[PDB]
Enzyme design. Structure first.
Site, mmCIF file in Angstrom:
data_model
loop_
_atom_site.group_PDB
_atom_site.id
_atom_site.type_symbol
_atom_site.label_atom_id
_atom_site.label_comp_id
_atom_site.label_asym_id
_atom_site.label_seq_id
_atom_site.Cartn_x
_atom_site.Cartn_y
_atom_site.Cartn_z
ATOM 1 N N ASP A 48 0.801 -1.219 0.000
ATOM 2 C CA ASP A 48 0.000 0.000 0.000
ATOM 3 C C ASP A 48 0.838 1.276 0.000
ATOM 4 O O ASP A 48 0.267 2.371 -0.008
ATOM 5 C CB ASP A 48 -1.015 0.004 1.150
ATOM 6 C CG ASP A 48 -0.362 -0.038 2.516
ATOM 7 O OD1 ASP A 48 0.870 0.137 2.605
ATOM 8 O OD2 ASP A 48 -1.085 -0.258 3.507
ATOM 9 N N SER A 50 2.904 2.146 2.477
ATOM 10 C CA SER A 50 3.394 2.383 3.818
ATOM 11 C C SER A 50 4.708 1.635 4.006
ATOM 12 O O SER A 50 5.115 0.836 3.173
ATOM 13 C CB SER A 50 2.381 1.904 4.854
ATOM 14 O OG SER A 50 2.142 0.515 4.709
ATOM 15 N N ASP A 52 7.311 -0.280 7.115
ATOM 16 C CA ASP A 52 7.498 -0.779 8.473
ATOM 17 C C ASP A 52 8.904 -0.429 8.958
ATOM 18 O O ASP A 52 9.874 -0.529 8.199
ATOM 19 C CB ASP A 52 7.348 -2.301 8.490
ATOM 20 C CG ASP A 52 5.934 -2.760 8.223
ATOM 21 O OD1 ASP A 52 5.017 -1.926 8.204
ATOM 22 O OD2 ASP A 52 5.737 -3.981 8.049
ATOM 23 N N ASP A 101 -4.516 -2.138 21.684
ATOM 24 C CA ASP A 101 -5.602 -1.607 20.875
ATOM 25 C C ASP A 101 -6.719 -2.614 20.618
ATOM 26 O O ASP A 101 -7.615 -2.333 19.817
ATOM 27 C CB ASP A 101 -5.067 -1.009 19.568
ATOM 28 C CG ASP A 101 -4.636 -2.061 18.559
ATOM 29 O OD1 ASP A 101 -4.816 -3.275 18.796
ATOM 30 O OD2 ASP A 101 -4.105 -1.662 17.503
#
Ligand SMILES: [Cl-]
Ligand SMILES: [Cl-]
Ligand SMILES: [Cl-]
Ligand SMILES: [Cl-]
Ligand code: NA
Length: 129
Positions: A48, A50, A52, A101
């Site tokens: 995508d 992004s 890491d 989360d």
């Protein structure tokens, strides 16, 4: 910095990760081994767009700002480059937010596929803590 196994275990223990949200220390060491090979400078780019970052491969889509992931969040309120430091504090503090989360350590694909359900205590065996 490329950590040794026991060196990283002791650093994570000092930073409060042992039994954090119920995850024993070996889980965190196992995840770091397969996410980054214990290398704080690891980066990997996702499909995508992004990226890491760091010893725990924290994703810029949600957790840090790298200035090139449009429409992403910065939930740890840090530049992603801070996750590449030889000092693991920023990575550990952000990982505590991630693991809290709701999804636990399943957020880390390598943990789910290579650590979950294994004898993770083996990762801290022999270490002086
Ligand atoms: Cl353990
Ligand atoms: Cl961005
Ligand atoms: Cl450190
Ligand atoms: Cl959990
Ligand atoms: Na971001």
């Amino acid at each position: 910095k490329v950590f040794g196994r026991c060196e990283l275990a002791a650093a994570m223990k000092r930073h409060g990760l042992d039994n954090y949200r119920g995850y024993s220390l070996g889980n965190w060491v196992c995840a770091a081994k397969f996410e980054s090979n214990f290398n704080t400078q690891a980066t990997n780019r996702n499909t995508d767009g992004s990226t890491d970052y760091g010893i725990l491969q924290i994703n810029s889509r949600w957790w840090c700002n790298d200035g090139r992931t449009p429409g992403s969040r910065n939930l740890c309120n840090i530049p992603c480059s801070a996750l590449l430091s030889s000092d693991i504090t920023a990575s550990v503090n952000c990982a505590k937010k991630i693991v809290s989360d709701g999804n636990g350590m399943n957020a880390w694909v390598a943990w789910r596929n290579r650590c979950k359900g294994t004898d993770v205590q083996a990762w801290i065996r022999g270490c002086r803590l």
